[PDB]
């Protein structure tokens, strides 16, 4: 799973995102982007952990840290999402109303 944790301009960076992500669950790995003014990336071994983490952190600041968390893949939205999210498989089964009534 891919995670995007940016918005580091208020005492919230690697340590902040680290404690948060870790608090929610054991991720795969954490990384920070020095290039940008305040952007970091995180990898979640599992999607569930990312969904709960992102939704939580993004849904509510952490210890006074309004960090910006997002999902690169595996986050189905109703918006004009171009990138195909990884929700399920769906390929072996199919149903579109074979009955002609």
UniProtKB/Swiss-Prot annotation:
Domain (RRM) ranges: 2-74
Tissue specificity remark: Brain, liver, kidney and lung.
Chain positions found as Phosphoserine: 22
Gene name, Swiss-Prot/TrEMBL: SRSF7
Keywords: Acetylation, Cytoplasm, Isopeptide bond, Metal-binding, mRNA processing, mRNA splicing, mRNA transport, Nucleus, Phosphoprotein, Repeat, Repressor, RNA-binding, Transport, Ubl conjugation, Zinc, Zinc-finger
Assembly behavior: Found in large molecular weight complexes containing CCNL1 and the p110 isoforms of either CDC2L1 or CDC2L2. Interacts with CCNL2 and CPSF6. Interacts with NXF1. Interacts with YTHDC1.
Transmembrane regions listed in the UniProt entry: none
Post-translational modifications reported in the UniProt record: Extensively phosphorylated on serine residues in the RS domain.
Superkingdom assignment: Eukaryota
UniProt family annotation: Belongs to the splicing factor SR family.
Naturally occurring in which organism (per UniProt): Homo sapiens (Human)
Region of interest: Sufficient for interaction with NXF1: 71-88
Compartment(s) where it occurs, according to its Swiss-Prot or TrEMBL record: Nucleus; Cytoplasm
Role: Required for pre-mRNA splicing. Can also modulate alternative splicing in vitro. Represses the splicing of MAPT/Tau exon 10. May function as export adapter involved in mRNA nuclear export such as of histone H2A. Binds mRNA which is thought to be transferred to the NXF1-NXT1 heterodimer for export (TAP/NXF1 pathway); enhances NXF1-NXT1 RNA-binding activity. RNA-binding is semi-sequence specific.
Name of protein: Serine/arginine-rich splicing factor 7
Keyword Transport applies: yes
Numbered residues of crosslink Glycyl lysine isopeptide (Lys-Gly) (interchain with G-Cter in SUMO2): 14
Gene Ontology BP annotations: cellular response to leukemia inhibitory factor; mRNA cis splicing, via spliceosome; mRNA processing; mRNA transport; negative regulation of mRNA splicing, via spliceosome; RNA splicing
GO molecular function, one term: mRNA binding
Positions carrying N6-acetyllysine: 14
GO cellular component, one term: nucleus
């Amino acid at each position: 799973m891919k995670v995007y944790v940016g918005n580091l301009g208020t005492g919230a960076g690697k340590g902040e995102l680290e404690r948060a992500f870790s608090y929610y669950g054991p991720l795969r790995t954490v990384w920070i982007a020095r290039n940008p003014p305040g952007f970091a990336f995180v990898e979640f071994e599992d999607p569930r952990d990312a969904e709960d983490a992102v939704r939580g952190l993004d849904g509510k600041v952490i210890c006074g840290s309004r960090v910006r968390v997002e999902l690169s893949t595996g986050m189905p939205r109703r918006s004009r999402f171009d990138r195909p999210p990884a929700r399920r498989k769906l390929l072996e089964v199919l149903f579109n109303g074979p009955l002609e009534h």
